[PDB]
């Protein structure tokens, strides 16, 4: 597959990196620290859902929906990460601290997967656009 100017593939990798960062960094981060790397992970998502929203009109109406869904689904997953982040802050100093972090990771993770799912959902979408 030709990775010339497929904006979406790059943003994806970008995002996935951002998550991974967080994954490995959080172990060594202060409470104020989280907020930023999640912001990073938040931002890369904005670039993605951005480029995808432009590619959209040039797709089979069928897939056009299938994607807008995994789009709105992606948002629900970020929000869960944000929530699970706030928990980690007001519980930074408690015996609960160790779990919320896990949940934060799980959240960032499931966000990353659903991003890949968005990818494939667009690929197949492009395939059908060609068959036309």
């Amino acid at each position: 597959l030709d990775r010339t100017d497929d904006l979406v593939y790059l943003n994806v990798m970008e995002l996935v990196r951002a998550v991974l960062e967080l994954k490995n960094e959080l172990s060594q981060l202060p409470p104020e620290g989280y907020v930023v790397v999640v912001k990073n992970v938040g931002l890369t998502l904005r670039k993605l859902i951005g480029s995808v929203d432009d590619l959209l009109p040039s797709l089979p109406s069928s897939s056009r929906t299938e994607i807008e869904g995994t789009q709105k689904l992606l948002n629900k997953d970020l929000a869960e990460l944000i929530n699970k982040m706030r928990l980690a802050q007001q519980n930074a100093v408690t015996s609960l601290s160790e779990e919320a972090k896990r949940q934060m990771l799980t959240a960032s993770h499931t966000l990353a997967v659903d991003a890949k799912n968005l990818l494939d959902a667009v690929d197949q979408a492009k395939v059908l656009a060609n068959l036309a």
Partner: peptide
């Protein structure tokens, strides 16, 4: 390829 590579790492 790298996306598969990175996702491999997460797992």
């Amino acid at each position: 390829s790298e996306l598969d590579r990175l996702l491999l790492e997460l797992n």
